[PDB]
Amino acid sequence: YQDVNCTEVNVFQTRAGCLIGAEHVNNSYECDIPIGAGICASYQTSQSIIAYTMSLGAENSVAYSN
Amino acid sequence: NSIAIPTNFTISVTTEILPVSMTKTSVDCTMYICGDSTECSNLLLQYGSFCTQLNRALTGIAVEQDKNTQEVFAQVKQIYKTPPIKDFGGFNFSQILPDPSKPSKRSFIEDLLFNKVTKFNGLTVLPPLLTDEMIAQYTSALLAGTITSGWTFGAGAALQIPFAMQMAYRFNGIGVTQNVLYENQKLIANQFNSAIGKIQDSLSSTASALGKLQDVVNQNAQALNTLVKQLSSNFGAISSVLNDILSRLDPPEAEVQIDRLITGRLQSLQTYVTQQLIRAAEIRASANLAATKMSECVLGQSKRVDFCGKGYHLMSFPQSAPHGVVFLHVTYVPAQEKNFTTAPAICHDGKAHFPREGVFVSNGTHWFVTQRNFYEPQIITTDNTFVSGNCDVVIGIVNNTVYDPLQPELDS
Amino acid sequence: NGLTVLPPLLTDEMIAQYTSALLAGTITSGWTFGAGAALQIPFAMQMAYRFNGIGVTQNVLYENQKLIANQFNSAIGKIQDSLSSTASALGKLQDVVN
Amino acid sequence: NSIAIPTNFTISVTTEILPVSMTKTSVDCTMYICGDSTECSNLLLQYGS
Amino acid sequence: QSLQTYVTQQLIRAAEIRASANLAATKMSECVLGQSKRVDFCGKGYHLM
Ligand SMILES: *[C@@H]1O[C@H](CO)[C@@H](O[C@@H]2O[C@H](CO)[C@@H](O)[C@H](O)[C@H]2NC(C)=O)[C@H](O)[C@H]1NC(C)=O
Ligand SMILES: *[C@@H]1O[C@H](CO)[C@@H](O[C@@H]2O[C@H](CO)[C@@H](O)[C@H](O)[C@H]2NC(C)=O)[C@H](O)[C@H]1NC(C)=O
Numbered sequence: 209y210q211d212v213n214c215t216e217v218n219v220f221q222t223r224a225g226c227l228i229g230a231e232h233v234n235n236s237y238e239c240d241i242p243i244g245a246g247i248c249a250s251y252q253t254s255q256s257i258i259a260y261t262m263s264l265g266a267e268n269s270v271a272y273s274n
Numbered sequence: 275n276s277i278a279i280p281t282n283f284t285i286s287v288t289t290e291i292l293p294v295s296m297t298k299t300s301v302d303c304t305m306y307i308c309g310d311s312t313e314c315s316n317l318l319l320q321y322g323s324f325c326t327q328l329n330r331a332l333t334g335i336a337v338e339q340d341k342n343t344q345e346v347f348a349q350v351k352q353i354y355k356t357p358p359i360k361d362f363g364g365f366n367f368s369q370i371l372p373d374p375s376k377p378s379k380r381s382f383i384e385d386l387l388f389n390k391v392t393k394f395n396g397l398t399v400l401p402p403l404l405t406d407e408m409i410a411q412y413t414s415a416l417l418a419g420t421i422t423s424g425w426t427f428g429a430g431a432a433l434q435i436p437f438a439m440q441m442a443y444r445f446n447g448i449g450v451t452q453n454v455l456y457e458n459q460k461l462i463a464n465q466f467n468s469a470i471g472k473i474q475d476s477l478s479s480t481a482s483a484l485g486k487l488q489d490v491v492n493q494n495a496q497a498l499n500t501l502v503k504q505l506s507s508n509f510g511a512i513s514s515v516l517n518d519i520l521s522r523l524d525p526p527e528a529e530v531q532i533d534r535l536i537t538g539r540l541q542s543l544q545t546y547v548t549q550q551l552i553r554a555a556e557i558r559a560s561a562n563l564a565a566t567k568m569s570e571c572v573l574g575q576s577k578r579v580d581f582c583g584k585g586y587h588l589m590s591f592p593q594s595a596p597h598g599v600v601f602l603h604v605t606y607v608p609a610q611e612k613n614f615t616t617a618p619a620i621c622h623d624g625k626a627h628f629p630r631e632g633v634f635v636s637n638g639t640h641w642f643v644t645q646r647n648f649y650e651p652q653i654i655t656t657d658n659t660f661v662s663g664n665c666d667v668v669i670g671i672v673n674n675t676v677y678d679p680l681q682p683e684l685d686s
Numbered sequence: 687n688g689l690t691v692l693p694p695l696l697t698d699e700m701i702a703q704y705t706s707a708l709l710a711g712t713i714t715s716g717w718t719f720g721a722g723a724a725l726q727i728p729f730a731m732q733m734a735y736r737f738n739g740i741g742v743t744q745n746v747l748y749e750n751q752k753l754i755a756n757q758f759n760s761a762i763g764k765i766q767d768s769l770s771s772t773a774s775a776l777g778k779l780q781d782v783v784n
Numbered sequence: 785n786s787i788a789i790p791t792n793f794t795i796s797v798t799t800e801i802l803p804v805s806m807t808k809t810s811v812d813c814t815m816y817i818c819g820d821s822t823e824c825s826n827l828l829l830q831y832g833s
Numbered sequence: 834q835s836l837q838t839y840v841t842q843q844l845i846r847a848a849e850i851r852a853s854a855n856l857a858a859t860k861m862s863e864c865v866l867g868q869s870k871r872v873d874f875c876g877k878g879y880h881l882m
């Protein structure tokens with residue numbers, strides 16, 4: 209529900225609106241079906257729709273030295 | 275017979291500011307054309323798909339703003355991070371790298387850029403898919419890659435190289451002999467650091483520097499204000515307020531007055547959507563230009579003249595801005611011009627000689643060979659020059675002497 | 687009917703001055719005026735750099751300088767003959783006007 | 785095992801033509817629609833912006 | 834309606850001209866002010882000037 213609070217409408221409040229039916233998952237993944245405001249959703253595990261903050265890629269420091 | 279060779283340089287950081295996206299507006303046209311009115315809605319259905327192709331056109335614009343923003347920023351397969359120690363040979367990126375003290379971890383110069391830029395009628399504003407905190411992880415990844423690994427993170431995985439060896443590589447890219455860096459490394463580090471200092475003075479003092487991004491935000495706000503104001507027009511109807519028509523006239527007459535309002539509001543929405551489709555092409559061509567500058571200037575070094583601001587391009591650092599990007603393009607500019615007599619070729623033992631690299635020049639009594647971009651005279655030898663043909667062919671050749679490094683080794 | 691045409695800010699004379707400046711720069715200082723100061727260079731040497739830039743050793747230019755200058759001069763004369771006789775040559779600009 | 789290497793060259797000059805600008809027209813929307821007419825202009829105002 | 838049609842066509846046409854102007858500006862910088870390594874960017878053949 210775009211641009212509404214989870215009041216008037218397994219409920220996840222995002223800045224894109226009130227998302228109902230998607231499980232909020234702490235693990236990030238590559239973006240699949242974009243929702244907005246950093247949140248994407250996908251169908252995964254038994255399977256269900258999940259919502260998560262998308263990953264921007266793996267973290268990799270460079271072994272920089274003089 | 276005269277060539278000017280500059281005996282010194284200045285390193286100039288020029289800001290280039292580019293729109294990259296615009297506000298993802300979307301309008302429930304069936305609410306804008308007919309608000310909470312069943313009688314009006316049933317009449318609007320007689321126009322078929324004139325609504326759903328406008329819901330569709332605006333959705334196409336809204337979806338591609340994240341395409342633009344992804345293509346410009348997400349040019350990196352990994353989120354690279356800077357080392358704990360800042361051992362960059364004297365260069366000082368602390369004003370363009372993240373500030374861990376902030377809630378959204380923008381750089382110092384990204385905070386200046388985020389400071390200088392400033393409904394009920396079916397209108398909405400959809401959020402971007404990349405939050406301005408995720409854009410700042412991508413520009414920090416592009417930038418921590420650029421600093422620690424040069425172009426190599428664009429070709430493969432990031433290969434570390436010391437920053438004094440990365441700039442020595444970029445000086446060879448502009449044809450300046452890389453020892454011109456090491457022999458001047460503190461001067462070059464200090465001119466980079468001082469030139470980054472001027473960026474803060476510019477962006478802090480002069481709000482008009484952001485003129486392109488504020489223009490894009492103003493055009494989108496002016497179009498929405500025009501669209502909302504156009505609800506107040508009668509278009510030939512007895513009233514612009516739909517409820518006042520319905521509360522006063524029976525259907526056989528109310529429908530006529532309503533059709534007048536429907537025609538006017540529908541044409542007035544098509545005008546907005548057509549303007550936004552043309553304005554979205556104007557931003558999409560700017561996102562593709564920003565994506566191209568990201569790929570060629572940041573992930574690389576550009577041989578294209580004036581592509582990365584005035585000067586010979588050395589490197590660029592991306593910073594984010596509200597609905598845009600900013601490139602801090604670092605360029606070598608040759609500065610202290612000097613005058614010399616010059617020769618196309620030199621004559622020695624009947625042979626003509628030409629410089630493998632550099633220009634034959636004369637301060638007025640002696641002849642030297644030297645790189646074109648930085649006065650650095652060399653005694654002329656068989657190692658700086660090659661023989662081809664003889665004296666009787668070149669126009670404007672000069673009868674100097676060319677030294678042989680082997681002779682004294684066999685003479686002694 | 688209310689239909690008018692506004693003049694351009696830069697008049698044809700001003701455009702001519704800019705192309706003149708760009709041309710004079712190109713001829714007397716090569717590319718240096720683009721990067722920074724216009725640094726005078728003997729034209730033949732400028733061409734030598736232009737040749738190295740395409741993978742042809744500079745001695746080729748000097749040894750063939752008379753040939754190259756003659757081919758260049760002839761090529762320009764051909765440009766004039768084409769533009770003076772082929773109306774369609776400027777079709778891209780005429781089409782905008784139309 | 786065969787390579788063709790040019791032994792001579794020619795300098796050619798070609799002409800590339802590009803549009804830069806278009807005529808800066810300007811239309812007075814009121815005069816166009818309701819030229820010198822008060823009665824028409826007042827009706828035109830009902831169309832707002 | 835006639836004006837709206839005209840203006841829309843001018844905006845679209847203006848975008849085409851703008852793209853051409855941008856190309857022309859790019860060439861000026863990367864063709865006149867410099868030397869192009871970009872193939873057929875500045876005519877067929879190896880660009881000199
Ligand atoms: C042009 O440069 C040469 C080399 O630097 C100058 O000749 C030398 O000048 C110095 C200082 O007077 C003497 O110590 C050397 O013995 C000279 N010979 C060499 C090394 O070439 C020359 O004087 C300069 N041009 C001028 C101003 O006449
Ligand atoms: C390269 O080609 C040019 C022609 O494009 C040759 O120059 C011509 O030589 C003939 C004699 O064989 C003369 O009659 C022409 O008038 C010359 N033309 C010009 C423009 O000079 C040139 O000799 C050739 N070079 C080589 C090495 O074969």
Ligand SMILES: *[C@@H]1O[C@H](CO)[C@@H](O)[C@H](O)[C@H]1NC(C)=O
Pocket residue numbers: 212213214215221222
């Ligand atoms: C929803 O309402 C609560 C108050 O009950 C408020 O604290 C919260 O911030 C609101 N969320 C949104 C997205 O408006």
Ligand SMILES: *[C@@H]1O[C@H](CO)[C@@H](O)[C@H](O)[C@H]1NC(C)=O
Pocket residue numbers: 232233234
């Ligand atoms: C994420 O982990 C925290 C514990 O660190 C937990 O409290 C929170 O409920 C988890 N959220 C989700 C969506 O699993």
Ligand SMILES: *[C@@H]1O[C@H](CO)[C@@H](O)[C@H](O)[C@H]1NC(C)=O
Pocket residue numbers: 611612613
């Ligand atoms: C080169 O000579 C010209 C002569 O007109 C003079 O104006 C110019 O300043 C001289 N350049 C330098 C670097 O001395």
